[PDB]
Amino acid sequence: YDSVECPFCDEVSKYEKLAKIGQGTFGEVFKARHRKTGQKVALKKVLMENEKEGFPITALREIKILQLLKHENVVNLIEICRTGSIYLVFDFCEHDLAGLLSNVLVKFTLSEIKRVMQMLLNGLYYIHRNKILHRDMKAANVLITRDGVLKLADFGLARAFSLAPNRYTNRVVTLWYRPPELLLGERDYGPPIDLWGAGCIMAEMWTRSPIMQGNTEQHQLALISQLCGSITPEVWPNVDNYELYEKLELVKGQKRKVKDRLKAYVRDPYALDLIDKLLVLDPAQRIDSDDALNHDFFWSDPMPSDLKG
Amino acid sequence: NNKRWYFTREQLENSPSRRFGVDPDKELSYRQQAANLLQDMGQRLNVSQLTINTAIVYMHRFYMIQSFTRFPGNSVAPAALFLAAKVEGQPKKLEHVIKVAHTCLHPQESLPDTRSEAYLQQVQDLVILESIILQTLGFELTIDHPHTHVVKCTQLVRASKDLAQTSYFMATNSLHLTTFSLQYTPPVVACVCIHLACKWSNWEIPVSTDGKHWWEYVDATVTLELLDELTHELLQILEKTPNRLKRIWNWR
Ligand SMILES: CNc1nc(C)c(-c2nc(Nc3cccc(S(N)(=O)=O)c3)ncc2C#N)s1
């Protein structure tokens, strides 16, 4: 009944709610305004539905990760607020890439698209450097500030990784941006899976729509083979030892049409070459965050440009 | 802040508990007890010492904000351990933790029916308390693991397994028995434990080829004056702890 001390956890009432930004009845995510400074923020309530084990361990993980990740291209957790209910408070970001790509009016120059991809890849390089896998790459999880700075967002499915043989969770990542490794049942993966996601997003910068929209995992794996060729120990050395390799009904006459199928939407040869190196089948031969930033795509005309426009 | 959870001796004197009439002495005991309870439960729940330590630190910090007069250790400890286990990726089931707490605190008492009102109540009581912990610590649960430091330390000094074992021993006890973790950074505490371990086992670390003492390579702030003062304090309380020293005493 008596009130108790809490110097380090403010009541969320300091913020004034404005409008449910997620709009997908997901997260209980609100835009808000600090009642004193007018500072805009995003509030995510910590879902307590069917929490039988106290504070959700998944929340704890995400919180651990947001606190660790402090970087210009990564969403910023300002603080956690109380009320019983709990809210993650973020710096508000005006736009998010998914919305911009779907908006017919919005239009990117090659120079600006370069900048976006540059910031995004930088973000990945940073989070991986810090032993974190994002595990949910998709345009929707990529925000851009009113000042044109890209922020990687939504670390709810992220997790720390390391060297040891690892046993990680398999059904991570939205279906359309999920990489081959996972769909073949791999549980000892790493940063290469986020790069695959970066690939689908890069291509999405011109197609304005997710390139590979499968209904089921075999359906998705079909689409991928009908873009990057089919899984061969020749193309992907050692795919064999995965139990589901032909046991997932896969074609055999598929030859990579990444550059052909997208030739249309993307003109610039460098852009296509980079996409091609991101959407590689074998995770071990898939280009990494560092090499990507080195790619001539970022060092040719038009050079990458800021984008307040 | 970086120095939010580090306190001066004067701040330690003026603890929340002191404000409710608790002697400096009693408070220190209340802490040591909680730490024992955490150790006992953690061993039975079969979690790591890392996790037990993490819980102990939460406890120490929790009581720089809250009073023992309002929150008994016998309550905070199980909640803190429950939490620590989750944070360190050794999650233990709520029922399981409540079960072990019960038998540690009431070895004779009869386990209640997990259907009773009285049990359903204490389940929610623990959850409630975990929450009061999270809010008191301001959701800052990443601890800097002191052992990792001792290892690197004893190593970049080339000590026998024995010397090393003993230093780890010193570290673990400094956590149960002192509030060093509330005053000094893990790297410093690590030096203190190595210093005392050397003193205890007559080992003498030769000055580096320069003339600089080993600890200067571990932390620039550290001085021989400080190390001697802190090892003396730690050794004093070690001498008050029945059988504790027997564990590292050379019986041969
Ligand atoms: C559902 N996933 C997300 N969680 C958080 C916390 C998100 C977030 N979103 C924004 N801005 C934003 C997101 C979607 C749509 C729009 S808009 N322009 O109003 O339609 C703005 N800023 C920060 C965060 C964070 N963290 S998104």
Coordinates of all heavy atoms in Angstrom, one line a residue, chain A residues 21-23 26 29 42 44 75 90-96 140-141 143 153-154, ligand 1:
Chain A
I21 N 1.6 4.4 -33.9 CA 2.3 4.4 -35.1 C 2.4 3.1 -35.9 O 2.2 3.0 -37.1 CB 3.7 4.9 -34.9 CG1 4.6 4.0 -34.1 CG2 3.7 6.3 -34.3 CD1 6.0 4.5 -33.8
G22 N 2.6 2.0 -35.1 CA 2.7 0.7 -35.7 C 1.5 0.3 -36.6 O 1.7 -0.2 -37.7
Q23 N 0.3 0.7 -36.1 CA -0.9 0.6 -36.9 C -1.2 -0.9 -37.3 O -2.3 -1.1 -37.9 CB -0.8 1.5 -38.2 CG -1.0 2.9 -37.9 CD -0.8 3.8 -39.1 OE1 -0.1 3.4 -40.1 NE2 -1.3 5.0 -39.0
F26 N 0.2 -4.2 -33.3 CA 1.4 -4.9 -32.9 C 2.4 -4.1 -32.1 O 2.8 -3.0 -32.5 CB 2.1 -5.6 -34.0 CG 2.5 -4.7 -35.2 CD1 3.4 -3.7 -35.0 CD2 1.9 -4.9 -36.4 CE1 3.8 -2.9 -36.1 CE2 2.3 -4.1 -37.5 CZ 3.2 -3.1 -37.3
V29 N 2.6 0.1 -29.9 CA 3.7 1.1 -30.2 C 3.1 2.5 -30.4 O 2.3 2.7 -31.4 CB 4.5 0.7 -31.4 CG1 5.5 1.8 -31.7 CG2 5.2 -0.6 -31.2
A42 N 9.1 7.3 -29.2 CA 8.2 6.1 -29.4 C 8.2 5.2 -28.2 O 9.2 4.9 -27.7 CB 8.7 5.3 -30.7
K44 N 7.1 1.6 -26.6 CA 6.7 0.2 -26.8 C 6.4 -0.4 -25.5 O 7.2 -0.5 -24.6 CB 7.8 -0.6 -27.5 CG 7.3 -1.8 -28.3 CD 8.4 -2.7 -28.7 CE 8.0 -3.8 -29.7 NZ 9.2 -4.2 -30.5
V75 N 18.8 2.4 -33.7 CA 17.8 2.9 -32.9 C 18.2 3.1 -31.5 O 18.9 2.2 -31.0 CB 16.5 2.0 -33.0 CG1 15.5 2.5 -32.0 CG2 15.9 2.1 -34.4
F90 N 11.9 5.0 -27.0 CA 12.9 5.4 -28.0 C 12.8 6.8 -28.5 O 11.8 7.4 -28.5 CB 12.8 4.4 -29.2 CG 12.8 3.0 -28.8 CD1 11.7 2.3 -28.5 CD2 14.0 2.3 -28.9 CE1 11.7 0.9 -28.1 CE2 14.1 0.9 -28.6 CZ 12.9 0.3 -28.2
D91 N 14.0 7.2 -29.0 CA 14.0 8.4 -29.9 C 13.1 8.2 -31.0 O 13.2 7.2 -31.7 CB 15.5 8.7 -30.3 CG 16.3 9.5 -29.3 OD1 15.7 10.2 -28.5 OD2 17.5 9.3 -29.3
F92 N 12.2 9.1 -31.3 CA 11.2 9.0 -32.4 C 11.9 9.2 -33.8 O 12.7 10.1 -34.0 CB 10.1 9.9 -32.3 CG 9.0 9.8 -33.3 CD1 8.2 8.7 -33.4 CD2 8.9 10.7 -34.3 CE1 7.2 8.5 -34.3 CE2 7.9 10.6 -35.3 CZ 7.1 9.5 -35.3
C93 N 11.5 8.4 -34.8 CA 12.0 8.5 -36.1 C 10.8 8.8 -37.0 O 9.8 8.0 -37.1 CB 12.7 7.2 -36.6 SG 14.3 7.0 -35.8
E94 N 10.9 9.9 -37.8 CA 9.9 10.4 -38.6 C 9.3 9.3 -39.6 O 8.2 8.9 -39.5 CB 10.3 11.6 -39.4 CG 9.2 12.2 -40.3 CD 8.0 12.6 -39.6 OE1 7.7 12.1 -38.5 OE2 7.2 13.5 -40.1
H95 N 10.2 8.7 -40.4 CA 9.8 7.8 -41.4 C 10.3 6.3 -41.1 O 11.2 6.1 -40.3 CB 10.2 8.2 -42.8 CG 10.3 9.6 -43.1 ND1 9.2 10.4 -43.5 CD2 11.3 10.5 -42.9 CE1 9.6 11.6 -43.7 NE2 10.8 11.8 -43.3
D96 N 9.7 5.4 -41.9 CA 10.4 4.1 -42.0 C 10.4 3.6 -43.4 O 9.4 3.7 -44.1 CB 9.7 3.1 -41.0 CG 8.7 2.2 -41.6 OD1 7.9 2.7 -42.4 OD2 8.8 1.0 -41.4
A140 N 10.7 -2.8 -43.2 CA 9.8 -2.3 -42.2 C 10.5 -1.9 -40.9 O 10.1 -1.0 -40.1 CB 8.7 -3.3 -41.9
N141 N 11.7 -2.6 -40.6 CA 12.5 -2.4 -39.4 C 13.6 -1.4 -39.6 O 14.5 -1.3 -38.8 CB 13.1 -3.8 -39.0 CG 12.0 -4.7 -38.4 OD1 11.0 -4.3 -38.0 ND2 12.3 -6.0 -38.3
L143 N 14.3 2.5 -40.1 CA 13.7 3.8 -40.0 C 14.6 4.9 -40.5 O 15.8 4.7 -40.5 CB 13.3 4.1 -38.5 CG 12.8 2.9 -37.8 CD1 12.7 3.1 -36.3 CD2 11.4 2.5 -38.3
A153 N 16.2 -1.0 -36.5 CA 15.2 -0.9 -35.4 C 14.7 -2.3 -35.1 O 15.0 -3.3 -35.8 CB 14.0 0.0 -35.7
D154 N 13.9 -2.5 -34.0 CA 13.3 -3.7 -33.7 C 14.2 -4.9 -33.4 O 14.5 -5.8 -34.2 CB 12.3 -4.2 -34.8 CG 11.1 -4.9 -34.3 OD1 11.3 -5.6 -33.2 OD2 10.0 -4.8 -34.9
Ligands
LIG1 C1 6.9 -2.5 -34.9 N1 8.3 -2.2 -34.8 C2 8.7 -0.9 -34.2 N2 9.1 -0.8 -32.9 C3 9.5 0.6 -32.7 C4 9.8 1.1 -31.3 C5 9.5 1.4 -33.9 C6 9.8 2.8 -34.1 N3 9.1 3.5 -35.0 C7 9.5 4.9 -35.3 N4 8.8 5.7 -36.3 C8 7.8 5.1 -37.2 C9 7.6 3.7 -37.4 C10 6.6 3.3 -38.3 C11 5.8 4.3 -39.0 C12 6.1 5.6 -38.7 S1 5.1 6.9 -39.4 N5 6.1 7.9 -40.3 O1 4.5 7.6 -38.3 O2 4.1 6.2 -40.3 C13 7.1 6.1 -37.8 N6 10.5 5.5 -34.6 C14 11.2 4.7 -33.7 C15 10.9 3.4 -33.4 C16 11.7 2.6 -32.5 N7 12.3 2.0 -31.7 S2 9.0 0.5 -35.0

